[PDB]
């Protein structure tokens, strides 16, 4: 019926992935891929590979029609955070969260 | 100009093994670091 | 006129560099803001070229970079950007009033999202 792909622990902040994933949620996969191609954000290429993986899964594992697919679900979940430090003035160090994302895309017929 | 202006010689002359051994209190220090089980005496 | 995030002298250097690149290569890829400034400067150099006389050649020479375009061979003598502007480029726009350049929009650059364009002679 539907096909999912996930990109786990991608080194991009979830907020930055979500602002893009919100454009493709509900679109036909052809339009979704165009939207990602012409959205100049660092998340666009990453989300494109998850979406094209989901479509390949739908065509190979579940013999679905790639011409009739819609993005049923798309969401970003928090992955494990890398903890870093930036030296600041007066010997003080400030925390830096190098956040990671789990990016899920589900495609379905209609 | 910061404290800590390194010198190989000054480090060993002030804090080295032979300087520690040269005084009774120096030997107390070695004995204490052996007792605690330090990898590095002196 | 555009300040292109540069001081006065830096901006004159940039314009001279790009103007020469467009005369030498005839098609270059750059940022939209740079292309919209280059069309003004290159079209004036081509106008000088069309005027053709020594006074115009020397006005162009004050602007165009001293770059070798090619080595042609008769002995083999180099061809300078100024010579290309007065002998190759200018003569091919002899019956065209202005509008010697065109800007094709390309798309944003990966590292800074800068809107890139092709600017070309024609």
């Amino acid at each position: 019926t539907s096909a999912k792909a996930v990109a786990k622990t991608v080194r991009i902040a979830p907020r930055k992935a979500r602002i893009v994933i919100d454009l493709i949620r509900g679109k036909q996969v052809g339009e979704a891929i165009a939207i990602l191609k012409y959205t100049p954000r660092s998340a666009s290429p990453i989300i494109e590979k998850v979406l094209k993986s989901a479509i390949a899964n739908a065509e190979h594992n579940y013999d679905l029609d790639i011409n009739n697919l819609v993005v049923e679900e798309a969401f970003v979940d928090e992955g494990p955070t890398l903890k870093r430090f930036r030296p600041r003035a007066q010997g003080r160090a400030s925390a830096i969260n190098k956040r990671t994302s789990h990016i899920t895309v589900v495609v379905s017929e209609v | 100009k910061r404290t800590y202006q390194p010198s190989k010689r000054k480090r060993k002359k002030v804090h080295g093994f032979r300087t520690r051994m040269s005084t009774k209190n120096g030997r107390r220090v070695l004995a204490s670091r052996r007792r605690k089980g330090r990898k590095v005496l002196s | 006129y555009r300040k292109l995030g540069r001081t006065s002298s830096q901006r004159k250097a940039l314009l001279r560099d790009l103007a020469t690149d467009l005369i030498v290569f005839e098609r270059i890829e750059t940022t939209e803001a740079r292309a919209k400034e280059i069309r003004k400067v290159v079209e004036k150099l081509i106008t000088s070229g069309k005027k053709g006389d020594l006074h115009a050649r020397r006005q162009a020479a004050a602007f165009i970079r001293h770059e070798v375009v090619e080595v042609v061979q008769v002995k083999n003598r180099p061809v300078y950007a100024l010579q290309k502007l007065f002998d190759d480029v200018a003569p091919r726009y002899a019956e065209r009033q202005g509008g010697y350049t065109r800007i094709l929009k390309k798309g944003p650059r990966r590292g800074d999202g800068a809107p890139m364009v092709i600017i070309e002679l024609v």
């Binding site: 602002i19 919100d22 454009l23 052809g30 165009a34 939207i35 012409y38 959205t39 | - | 929009k105 390309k106």
Partner: protein, 53 residues
């Protein structure tokens, strides 16, 4: 200088009502048959949709 109170979830979410992207301005080409930004050159065909290069 500093926040007097932490910002609630609701208030944070209201502030972000306008923090979003717009869809790109695009359309299907005739010669290519695929999407392209208007007033841009289409790489699928490899030139400007109308003016051949």
């Amino acid at each position: 200088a500093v926040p007097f109170r932490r910002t609630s979830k609701a208030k944070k979410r209201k502030r972000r009502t306008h923090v979003k992207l717009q869809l790109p301005g695009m359309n299907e080409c005739s010669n290519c048959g695929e999407y392209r930004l208007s007033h841009h050159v289409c790489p699928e065909c490899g030139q400007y949709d109308g003016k051949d290069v």
